[PDB]
From Swiss-Prot:
Family: Belongs to the peptidase A1 family.
Top-level taxon: Eukaryota
Disulfides per UniProt: C255-C290
EC number(s) from the headed UniProt entry: 3.4.23.22
GO molecular function, one term: aspartic-type endopeptidase activity
Record's protein name: Endothiapepsin
Ranges for domain Peptidase A1: 17-328
Biological process, per Gene Ontology: proteolysis
Catalytic activity: Hydrolysis of proteins with specificity similar to that of pepsin A, prefers hydrophobic residues at P1 and P1', but does not cleave 14-Ala-|-Leu-15 in the B chain of insulin or Z-Glu-Tyr. Clots milk
Organism this protein belongs to: Cryphonectria parasitica
The entry's keywords: Aspartyl protease, Disulfide bond, Hydrolase, Protease, Signal, Zymogen
Active site: D35, S199
Amino acid sequence: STGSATTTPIDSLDDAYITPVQIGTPAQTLNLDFDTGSSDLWVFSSETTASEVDGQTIYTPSKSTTAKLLSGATWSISYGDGSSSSGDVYTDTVSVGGLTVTGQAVESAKKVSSSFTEDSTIDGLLGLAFSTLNTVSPTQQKTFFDNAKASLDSPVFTADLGYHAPGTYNFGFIDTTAYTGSITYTAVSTKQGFWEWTSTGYAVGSGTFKSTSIDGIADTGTTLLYLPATVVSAYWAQVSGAKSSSSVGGYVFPCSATLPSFTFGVGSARIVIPGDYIDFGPISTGSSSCFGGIQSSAGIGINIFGDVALKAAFVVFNGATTPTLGFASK
């Protein structure tokens, strides 16, 4: 089997992407944030505290003839941005782009943190990291991809995120028309539960490529590109007026600036992020200070190839017995 679904930016900055997901019988369609940096499929639901729902579409398990409570199971998650959610668990039928999994753990939120409530466009998350990170207790549950894998034509999914435009998540096949050139594959460590890999270096604008190993994770659920402070300083030094602002929380630059591109290495190959992709707009409405899309990871503990980087590529998440990542230009 295969599946194919369009993913759509939630706003004009590409802050996140939502993909329609069918849950239950009859289907309840929720727009989920597919997140290769986490491993829980959780949804706003009829069980979510009413004051914490503000415009999201909810899953109502009592209206699904295929829903079953997973007795005793609870979940609780905290993300790198400080947000969180928790609740209980049902199993139900879940379909993405025509690919159906029966008995998928659907984690129903009883509580969500304010950032989720305040984002009416995201009805939940669909995790695509390794199932070892799944938070369900006392019996850890498998991701949608893990459950689907054996049925797929090939044990892979691909992320093709758009710049200010829709893109595609495919399951079970490589669309060879969706990228240019060849796909360069690179080794993955699953030791932290992430799609963790090592970039071979970087360049700023038309500058020379610096060969240096940068370990990080491919994370569709993170907006920006978080890299070591040395790398980030080298980038923003090429933007007149750019500076790191403790009060704003990162590098800012004059909105009148033209940003240079940023290149990252994948083996001997190179992925070029156009300068425009690094502009995240005014820090507040009407400001002439703009927020940068490349930020320091120094306070995170891990480097994160978030959407800024991933949307410059066609990305293969190869879930074979030894997983690997593939990147192509597009």
